Amino acid sequence: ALTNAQILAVIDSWEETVGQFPVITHHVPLGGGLQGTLHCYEIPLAAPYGVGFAKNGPTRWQYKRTINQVVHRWGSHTVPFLLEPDNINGKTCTASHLCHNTRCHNPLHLCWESLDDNKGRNWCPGPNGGCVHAVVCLRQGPLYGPGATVAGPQQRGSHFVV
Amino acid sequence: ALTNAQILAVIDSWEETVGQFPVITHHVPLGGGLQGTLHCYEIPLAAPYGVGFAKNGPTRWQYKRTINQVVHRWGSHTVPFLLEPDNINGKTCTASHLCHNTRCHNPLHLCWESLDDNKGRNWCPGPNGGCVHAVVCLRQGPLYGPGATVAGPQQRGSHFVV
DNA sequence: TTGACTCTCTTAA
DNA sequence: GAGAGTCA
DNA sequence: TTGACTCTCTTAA
DNA sequence: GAGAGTCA
Ligand SMILES: [Mg+2]
Ligand SMILES: [Mg+2]
Ligand SMILES: [Zn+2]
Ligand SMILES: [Zn+2]
Ligand SMILES: [Zn+2]
Ligand SMILES: [Zn+2]
């Protein structure tokens, strides 16, 4: 809600509730042929999810609190960042999973960045494979690799140069 | 249905027309601090665009030919790939700009790949910076770099470990 | 047969 | 990746 | 007040 | 990144 104290209280109650989510160990590629381990705090697959939480989409949740007798509601991963600017360079800030695990609500696995920065982590070589993200990746992106391109650049005649 | 010969004729007429689009010389990052040059064949900003071409969105065009009284229409960048498989690994193939220049219709700047592969090229370090795409990038992706993350992973209490 | 517009849709963050 | 409404 | 559902929207390929 | 309709 409006006051800094009220926002800190929201963040604290969110952390206490998420802190009781099941902790699931995931072994992940780091890049450079190395492997690491992440501890994700995973929201349940079905109701009940935890105090304040409700599912608004297949992999979308919201956190809800009653303050000043009114309901305030946020996307479930946005709560850690309620005291941060909500835009950067005129682009909306978004919660970005460094563990690439939507059910995870561990704030140590989240950052707050443009949707472009967020998406781009899917292809990052990872913290041991050349990640250049200033807020460093926790793992190699799940889509990193050679790709599966069906056809490359080509011409039939002689009209074009690279 | 169109024969192979008819499809080749479509590709040939498309190439002939695109080959008369203005050719614009662009200096681009290749990765590794190197600069290179790409020559884009850019569709005009406003009508007329060229024989067979019409704009269906701000940066979307289509190519249309009438063969034996039947109107055939394709996305304007898909024509080079009409003799290729249209899906791979259960995903639809998309025209993917290696030059990251939507208006460009140079087929030497296009490849044919899943939408995920296509998107991921935006963040590639480039052919001189560590590109691992099997069909190699022509340039460093426009969104490559450290990013502009507003807030990193953080907690207020001690409920979490990474 | 053709040009120049119109509309909505897909994907996965 | 988001916001908001309908019920109990 | 709290829970468990419903709906549509944003972005840039 | 796509498909399709209307009108002259
Ligand atoms: Mg993400
Ligand atoms: Mg692209
Ligand atoms: Zn996680
Ligand atoms: Zn990274
Ligand atoms: Zn080009
Ligand atoms: Zn590449």
Tab-separated table of C-alpha atoms (C1' of nucleotides) and ligand atoms in Angstrom:
chain	number	residue	atom	x	y	z
A	1	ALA	CA	0.000	0.000	0.000
A	2	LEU	CA	0.920	3.666	0.205
A	3	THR	CA	3.417	3.830	3.154
A	4	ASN	CA	7.005	2.511	3.086
A	5	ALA	CA	6.216	0.710	6.361
A	6	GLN	CA	3.135	-0.919	4.769
A	7	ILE	CA	5.239	-2.006	1.727
A	8	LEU	CA	8.021	-3.463	3.935
A	9	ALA	CA	5.297	-5.368	5.844
A	10	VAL	CA	3.962	-6.763	2.540
A	11	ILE	CA	7.437	-7.858	1.537
A	12	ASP	CA	8.062	-9.431	4.948
A	13	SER	CA	4.778	-11.365	4.974
A	14	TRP	CA	5.400	-12.538	1.388
A	15	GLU	CA	8.903	-13.796	2.295
A	16	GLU	CA	7.623	-15.633	5.403
A	17	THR	CA	4.922	-17.413	3.357
A	18	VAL	CA	7.167	-18.230	0.329
A	19	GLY	CA	9.832	-19.383	2.821
A	20	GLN	CA	7.489	-22.240	3.740
A	21	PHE	CA	7.073	-23.419	0.126
A	22	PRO	CA	8.687	-26.808	-0.605
A	23	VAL	CA	12.397	-26.427	-1.368
A	24	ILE	CA	13.261	-28.355	-4.521
A	25	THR	CA	16.878	-28.973	-5.464
A	26	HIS	CA	17.600	-28.494	-9.185
A	27	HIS	CA	20.917	-29.388	-10.788
A	28	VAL	CA	21.611	-26.996	-13.628
A	29	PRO	CA	24.169	-26.327	-16.385
A	30	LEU	CA	26.432	-23.387	-15.597
A	31	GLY	CA	28.198	-23.226	-18.942
A	32	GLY	CA	31.740	-24.384	-19.585
A	33	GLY	CA	30.729	-27.987	-18.963
A	34	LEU	CA	30.140	-27.273	-15.258
A	35	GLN	CA	27.051	-28.041	-13.178
A	36	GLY	CA	25.625	-26.341	-10.086
A	37	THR	CA	22.696	-26.644	-7.725
A	38	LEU	CA	19.814	-24.221	-7.120
A	39	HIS	CA	17.249	-24.382	-4.309
A	40	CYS	CA	13.891	-23.261	-5.684
A	41	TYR	CA	10.989	-22.481	-3.349
A	42	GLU	CA	8.128	-23.786	-5.464
A	43	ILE	CA	4.505	-22.683	-5.185
A	44	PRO	CA	2.171	-25.727	-5.046
A	45	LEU	CA	0.630	-27.083	-8.243
A	46	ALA	CA	-2.918	-26.700	-6.916
A	47	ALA	CA	-4.868	-24.878	-4.253
A	48	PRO	CA	-4.206	-24.128	-1.485
A	49	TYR	CA	-0.991	-22.290	-2.473
A	50	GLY	CA	-0.280	-20.299	0.685
A	51	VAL	CA	-1.693	-17.359	2.594
A	52	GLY	CA	-2.305	-14.491	0.210
A	53	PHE	CA	-1.673	-16.438	-3.018
A	54	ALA	CA	-4.056	-17.320	-5.843
A	55	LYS	CA	-3.542	-18.656	-9.370
A	56	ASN	CA	-4.665	-16.406	-12.218
A	57	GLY	CA	-3.162	-18.461	-15.048
A	58	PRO	CA	-1.548	-21.833	-15.807
A	59	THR	CA	1.790	-20.440	-14.586
A	60	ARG	CA	0.621	-17.056	-13.229
A	61	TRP	CA	-0.114	-16.184	-9.590
A	62	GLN	CA	-0.974	-13.080	-7.591
A	63	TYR	CA	-0.334	-12.017	-3.996
A	64	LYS	CA	-3.179	-10.215	-2.210
A	65	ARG	CA	-3.314	-8.299	1.095
A	66	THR	CA	-6.035	-6.250	2.824
A	67	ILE	CA	-4.575	-2.850	3.912
A	68	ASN	CA	-6.618	0.190	5.020
A	69	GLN	CA	-9.676	-2.145	4.652
A	70	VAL	CA	-8.959	-2.306	0.857
A	71	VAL	CA	-7.516	-5.156	-1.225
A	72	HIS	CA	-4.086	-4.538	-2.774
A	73	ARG	CA	-2.877	-7.123	-5.286
A	74	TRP	CA	0.370	-7.753	-7.171
A	75	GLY	CA	1.825	-10.283	-9.572
A	76	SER	CA	3.267	-12.953	-7.268
A	77	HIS	CA	6.924	-12.433	-8.314
A	78	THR	CA	6.792	-8.607	-8.239
A	79	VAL	CA	6.526	-8.246	-4.458
A	80	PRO	CA	10.292	-8.217	-3.665
A	81	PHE	CA	10.685	-5.156	-5.883
A	82	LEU	CA	7.821	-2.948	-4.672
A	83	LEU	CA	10.281	-0.245	-3.547
A	84	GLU	CA	12.124	-0.169	-6.883
A	85	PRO	CA	11.471	1.995	-9.949
A	86	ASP	CA	8.814	0.325	-12.082
A	87	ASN	CA	10.419	1.337	-15.379
A	88	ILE	CA	13.859	1.730	-16.904
A	89	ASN	CA	14.660	3.792	-19.997
A	90	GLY	CA	10.899	3.998	-20.529
A	91	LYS	CA	10.433	0.204	-20.493
A	92	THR	CA	8.356	-1.649	-17.911
A	93	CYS	CA	10.287	-3.548	-15.258
A	94	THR	CA	9.449	-7.214	-14.933
A	95	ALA	CA	10.232	-9.990	-12.484
A	96	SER	CA	12.851	-12.195	-14.200
A	97	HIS	CA	13.575	-15.787	-13.159
A	98	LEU	CA	17.311	-16.502	-13.043
A	99	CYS	CA	16.406	-20.185	-12.357
A	100	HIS	CA	14.019	-20.294	-15.343
A	101	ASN	CA	11.464	-22.016	-13.019
A	102	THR	CA	8.097	-20.170	-13.044
A	103	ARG	CA	6.718	-21.931	-9.887
A	104	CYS	CA	9.800	-20.742	-7.988
A	105	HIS	CA	9.299	-17.702	-5.783
A	106	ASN	CA	12.784	-17.626	-4.181
A	107	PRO	CA	13.712	-13.909	-4.274
A	108	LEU	CA	17.372	-14.963	-4.496
A	109	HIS	CA	16.394	-16.350	-7.927
A	110	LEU	CA	14.616	-13.168	-9.129
A	111	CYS	CA	15.716	-9.877	-10.624
A	112	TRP	CA	13.860	-6.781	-11.844
A	113	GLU	CA	14.597	-5.734	-15.421
A	114	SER	CA	13.106	-4.952	-18.808
A	115	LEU	CA	11.211	-7.701	-20.608
A	116	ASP	CA	13.965	-7.731	-23.260
A	117	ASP	CA	16.690	-8.353	-20.632
A	118	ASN	CA	14.429	-10.993	-19.058
A	119	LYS	CA	13.863	-12.872	-22.329
A	120	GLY	CA	17.525	-12.694	-23.307
A	121	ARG	CA	18.602	-14.771	-20.338
A	122	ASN	CA	16.996	-17.803	-22.053
A	123	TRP	CA	19.992	-17.894	-24.432
A	124	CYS	CA	22.814	-16.885	-22.085
A	125	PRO	CA	25.844	-19.224	-22.020
A	126	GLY	CA	25.771	-18.970	-18.221
A	127	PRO	CA	28.030	-17.852	-15.378
A	128	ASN	CA	30.780	-20.340	-16.326
A	129	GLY	CA	30.305	-20.049	-20.088
A	130	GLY	CA	30.622	-16.324	-20.758
A	131	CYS	CA	27.630	-14.551	-19.195
A	132	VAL	CA	28.081	-10.777	-19.484
A	133	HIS	CA	24.902	-9.784	-17.618
A	134	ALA	CA	25.818	-7.166	-15.000
A	135	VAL	CA	23.378	-8.922	-12.662
A	136	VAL	CA	24.893	-12.328	-13.340
A	137	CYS	CA	22.947	-15.386	-14.453
A	138	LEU	CA	22.614	-18.345	-12.087
A	139	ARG	CA	22.649	-20.893	-14.922
A	140	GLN	CA	23.072	-21.347	-18.636
A	141	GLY	CA	19.847	-20.397	-20.388
A	142	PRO	CA	17.648	-23.371	-21.358
A	143	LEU	CA	17.657	-22.370	-25.050
A	144	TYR	CA	21.413	-21.852	-25.365
A	145	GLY	CA	22.932	-23.893	-28.158
A	146	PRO	CA	23.348	-24.319	-31.914
A	147	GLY	CA	19.645	-24.178	-32.724
A	148	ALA	CA	17.816	-26.310	-35.263
A	149	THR	CA	17.767	-24.072	-38.323
A	150	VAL	CA	16.003	-25.725	-41.264
A	151	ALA	CA	17.406	-23.550	-44.073
A	152	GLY	CA	20.140	-20.929	-44.162
A	153	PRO	CA	20.581	-17.826	-46.316
A	154	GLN	CA	20.390	-18.579	-50.024
A	155	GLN	CA	19.549	-17.132	-53.423
A	156	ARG	CA	18.647	-18.714	-56.754
A	157	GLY	CA	20.065	-15.972	-58.988
A	158	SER	CA	22.783	-13.304	-58.782
A	159	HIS	CA	20.828	-10.304	-57.479
A	160	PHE	CA	22.169	-10.163	-53.918
A	161	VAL	CA	25.349	-9.719	-51.897
A	162	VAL	CA	25.753	-10.148	-48.171
B	1	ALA	CA	-1.721	-27.081	-55.935
B	2	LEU	CA	1.367	-25.282	-57.280
B	3	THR	CA	4.030	-27.419	-58.956
B	4	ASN	CA	7.734	-27.203	-58.007
B	5	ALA	CA	8.287	-25.289	-61.266
B	6	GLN	CA	5.522	-22.815	-60.352
B	7	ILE	CA	7.055	-22.296	-56.859
B	8	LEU	CA	10.507	-21.715	-58.376
B	9	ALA	CA	8.920	-19.176	-60.716
B	10	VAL	CA	7.409	-17.400	-57.683
B	11	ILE	CA	10.794	-17.358	-55.943
B	12	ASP	CA	12.457	-16.003	-59.100
B	13	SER	CA	9.930	-13.172	-59.555
B	14	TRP	CA	10.274	-12.299	-55.863
B	15	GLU	CA	14.072	-12.161	-56.157
B	16	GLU	CA	13.909	-10.015	-59.311
B	17	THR	CA	11.658	-7.512	-57.522
B	18	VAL	CA	13.531	-7.439	-54.194
B	19	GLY	CA	16.787	-7.029	-56.121
B	20	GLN	CA	15.537	-3.582	-57.185
B	21	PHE	CA	14.811	-2.454	-53.616
B	22	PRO	CA	17.231	0.274	-52.453
B	23	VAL	CA	20.460	-1.344	-51.258
B	24	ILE	CA	21.642	0.291	-48.050
B	25	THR	CA	25.144	-0.202	-46.643
B	26	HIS	CA	25.139	-0.658	-42.840
B	27	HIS	CA	28.176	-0.869	-40.568
B	28	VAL	CA	27.504	-3.420	-37.816
B	29	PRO	CA	29.199	-4.992	-34.799
B	30	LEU	CA	30.455	-8.535	-35.400
B	31	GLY	CA	31.482	-9.226	-31.817
B	32	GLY	CA	34.965	-9.155	-30.376
B	33	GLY	CA	35.192	-5.409	-30.975
B	34	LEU	CA	35.198	-5.878	-34.765
B	35	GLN	CA	33.025	-4.004	-37.246
B	36	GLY	CA	31.669	-5.361	-40.511
B	37	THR	CA	29.333	-4.318	-43.323
B	38	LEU	CA	25.912	-5.652	-44.347
B	39	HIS	CA	24.052	-4.679	-47.524
B	40	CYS	CA	20.300	-4.659	-46.904
B	41	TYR	CA	17.686	-4.552	-49.664
B	42	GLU	CA	15.068	-2.421	-47.956
B	43	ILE	CA	11.384	-2.365	-48.852
B	44	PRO	CA	10.148	1.256	-49.206
B	45	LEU	CA	8.544	3.015	-46.236
B	46	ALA	CA	5.290	3.699	-48.107
B	47	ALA	CA	3.396	2.529	-51.164
B	48	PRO	CA	4.289	1.605	-53.844
B	49	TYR	CA	6.595	-1.114	-52.490
B	50	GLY	CA	7.230	-3.161	-55.631
B	51	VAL	CA	5.348	-5.538	-57.894
B	52	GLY	CA	3.460	-8.082	-55.799
B	53	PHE	CA	4.117	-6.427	-52.424
B	54	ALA	CA	1.641	-4.930	-49.963
B	55	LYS	CA	1.821	-3.840	-46.332
B	56	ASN	CA	-0.412	-5.643	-43.851
B	57	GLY	CA	1.117	-4.124	-40.719
B	58	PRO	CA	3.501	-1.390	-39.534
B	59	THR	CA	6.454	-3.723	-40.209
B	60	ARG	CA	4.639	-6.604	-41.945
B	61	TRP	CA	4.306	-7.214	-45.676
B	62	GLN	CA	2.947	-9.914	-47.971
B	63	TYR	CA	3.799	-11.110	-51.488
B	64	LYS	CA	0.905	-12.026	-53.787
B	65	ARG	CA	0.810	-13.753	-57.188
B	66	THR	CA	-2.191	-14.956	-59.199
B	67	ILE	CA	-1.543	-18.316	-60.872
B	68	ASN	CA	-4.148	-19.884	-63.161
B	69	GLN	CA	-6.825	-17.562	-61.737
B	70	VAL	CA	-6.019	-18.436	-58.093
B	71	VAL	CA	-4.605	-15.785	-55.769
B	72	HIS	CA	-1.683	-17.064	-53.685
B	73	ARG	CA	-0.265	-14.981	-50.858
B	74	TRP	CA	2.736	-15.429	-48.551
B	75	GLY	CA	4.438	-13.500	-45.792
B	76	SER	CA	6.930	-11.297	-47.635
B	77	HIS	CA	10.023	-12.869	-46.024
B	78	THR	CA	8.826	-16.497	-46.351
B	79	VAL	CA	9.138	-16.739	-50.139
B	80	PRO	CA	12.834	-17.839	-50.236
B	81	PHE	CA	11.855	-20.890	-48.183
B	82	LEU	CA	8.793	-22.165	-50.086
B	83	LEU	CA	10.627	-25.385	-51.054
B	84	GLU	CA	11.649	-26.102	-47.466
B	85	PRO	CA	9.905	-27.976	-44.654
B	86	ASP	CA	7.565	-25.623	-42.807
B	87	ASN	CA	8.091	-27.148	-39.342
B	88	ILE	CA	10.876	-28.774	-37.328
B	89	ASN	CA	10.825	-30.562	-33.955
B	90	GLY	CA	7.075	-29.830	-33.915
B	91	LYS	CA	7.578	-26.056	-34.162
B	92	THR	CA	6.567	-23.739	-37.013
B	93	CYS	CA	9.423	-22.391	-39.119
B	94	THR	CA	9.739	-18.589	-39.305
B	95	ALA	CA	11.743	-16.198	-41.451
B	96	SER	CA	14.557	-14.930	-39.226
B	97	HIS	CA	16.525	-11.743	-39.996
B	98	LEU	CA	20.260	-12.281	-39.547
B	99	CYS	CA	20.655	-8.521	-40.141
B	100	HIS	CA	17.963	-7.605	-37.562
B	101	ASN	CA	16.461	-5.151	-40.139
B	102	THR	CA	12.728	-5.839	-40.611
B	103	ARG	CA	12.473	-3.867	-43.924
B	104	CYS	CA	15.320	-5.895	-45.379
B	105	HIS	CA	14.262	-8.605	-47.824
B	106	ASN	CA	17.769	-9.717	-48.858
B	107	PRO	CA	17.487	-13.545	-48.837
B	108	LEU	CA	21.195	-13.727	-47.959
B	109	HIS	CA	20.154	-12.067	-44.677
B	110	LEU	CA	17.362	-14.544	-43.860
B	111	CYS	CA	17.163	-18.017	-42.390
B	112	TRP	CA	14.270	-20.383	-41.669
B	113	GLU	CA	14.001	-21.620	-38.091
B	114	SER	CA	11.807	-21.889	-35.021
B	115	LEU	CA	10.543	-18.694	-33.428
B	116	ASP	CA	12.703	-19.428	-30.343
B	117	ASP	CA	15.865	-19.747	-32.482
B	118	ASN	CA	14.850	-16.563	-34.324
B	119	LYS	CA	14.342	-14.541	-31.118
B	120	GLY	CA	17.554	-15.812	-29.520
B	121	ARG	CA	19.693	-14.264	-32.217
B	122	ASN	CA	18.853	-10.832	-30.674
B	123	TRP	CA	21.288	-11.605	-27.828
B	124	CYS	CA	24.015	-13.487	-29.712
B	125	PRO	CA	27.591	-12.217	-29.205
B	126	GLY	CA	28.115	-12.487	-32.962
B	127	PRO	CA	30.252	-14.367	-35.476
B	128	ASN	CA	33.449	-12.861	-34.036
B	129	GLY	CA	32.328	-12.913	-30.395
B	130	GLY	CA	31.379	-16.530	-29.726
B	131	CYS	CA	28.303	-17.352	-31.829
B	132	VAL	CA	27.434	-21.058	-31.559
B	133	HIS	CA	24.486	-21.020	-34.001
B	134	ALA	CA	25.005	-23.811	-36.539
B	135	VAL	CA	23.731	-21.399	-39.198
B	136	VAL	CA	26.082	-18.628	-38.117
B	137	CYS	CA	24.957	-15.100	-37.245
B	138	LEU	CA	25.951	-12.262	-39.566
B	139	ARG	CA	26.323	-9.792	-36.710
B	140	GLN	CA	26.214	-9.365	-32.974
B	141	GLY	CA	22.614	-9.219	-31.804
B	142	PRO	CA	21.297	-5.716	-31.080
B	143	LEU	CA	20.406	-6.620	-27.484
B	144	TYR	CA	23.720	-8.294	-26.593
B	145	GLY	CA	25.469	-6.790	-23.602
B	146	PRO	CA	25.366	-6.373	-19.822
B	147	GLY	CA	21.734	-5.268	-19.749
B	148	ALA	CA	20.150	-2.615	-17.555
B	149	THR	CA	18.876	-4.605	-14.594
B	150	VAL	CA	17.248	-2.335	-12.015
B	151	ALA	CA	17.399	-4.622	-8.973
B	152	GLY	CA	19.129	-7.933	-8.401
B	153	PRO	CA	18.292	-10.930	-6.237
B	154	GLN	CA	17.784	-9.950	-2.614
B	155	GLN	CA	15.965	-10.828	0.592
B	156	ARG	CA	15.084	-8.815	3.687
B	157	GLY	CA	15.228	-11.689	6.184
B	158	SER	CA	16.986	-15.060	6.292
B	159	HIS	CA	14.283	-17.363	4.906
B	160	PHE	CA	16.118	-18.272	1.715
B	161	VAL	CA	19.323	-19.734	0.318
B	162	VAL	CA	20.195	-19.711	-3.444
C	1	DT	C1'	-4.785	-9.756	-61.830
C	2	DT	C1'	-3.208	-6.130	-59.144
C	3	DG	C1'	-2.472	-2.414	-55.461
C	4	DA	C1'	-3.449	-0.443	-51.182
C	5	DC	C1'	-5.532	-0.618	-47.674
C	6	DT	C1'	-8.354	-3.282	-43.667
C	7	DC	C1'	-8.701	-6.832	-39.767
C	8	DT	C1'	-7.099	-10.485	-36.323
C	9	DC	C1'	-3.640	-14.256	-34.858
C	10	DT	C1'	1.052	-16.924	-32.568
C	11	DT	C1'	4.605	-17.542	-29.090
C	12	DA	C1'	6.680	-17.460	-24.543
C	13	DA	C1'	8.801	-14.379	-21.503
D	1	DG	C1'	5.814	-11.404	-18.672
D	2	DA	C1'	0.985	-8.462	-16.522
D	3	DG	C1'	-3.930	-6.293	-14.551
D	4	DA	C1'	-8.643	-6.965	-12.946
D	5	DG	C1'	-13.627	-9.254	-11.919
D	6	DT	C1'	-16.798	-13.035	-9.864
D	7	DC	C1'	-18.234	-15.507	-6.469
D	8	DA	C1'	-18.339	-18.033	-1.624
E	1	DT	C1'	-11.004	-11.065	5.104
E	2	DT	C1'	-9.401	-14.749	2.684
E	3	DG	C1'	-9.633	-18.264	-0.928
E	4	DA	C1'	-10.376	-20.081	-5.582
E	5	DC	C1'	-11.581	-19.435	-9.512
E	6	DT	C1'	-12.700	-16.472	-14.145
E	7	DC	C1'	-11.329	-13.147	-17.926
E	8	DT	C1'	-8.235	-10.249	-20.985
E	9	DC	C1'	-3.715	-7.609	-21.694
E	10	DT	C1'	1.829	-6.475	-23.088
E	11	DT	C1'	5.909	-7.092	-25.830
E	12	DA	C1'	8.662	-7.920	-29.975
E	13	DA	C1'	10.161	-11.574	-32.732
F	1	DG	C1'	6.951	-13.523	-36.084
F	2	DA	C1'	1.915	-14.911	-39.102
F	3	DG	C1'	-3.068	-15.532	-41.964
F	4	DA	C1'	-6.986	-13.544	-44.403
F	5	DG	C1'	-10.910	-9.839	-46.385
F	6	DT	C1'	-12.602	-5.725	-49.249
F	7	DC	C1'	-12.864	-2.955	-53.160
F	8	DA	C1'	-12.094	-1.132	-57.640
G	1	MG	MG	12.619	-15.061	-17.720
G	2	MG	MG	14.628	-12.131	-35.689
G	3	ZN	ZN	14.297	-20.909	-8.444
G	4	ZN	ZN	23.771	-14.163	-18.386
G	5	ZN	ZN	19.504	-7.079	-44.270
G	6	ZN	ZN	24.663	-16.474	-33.271
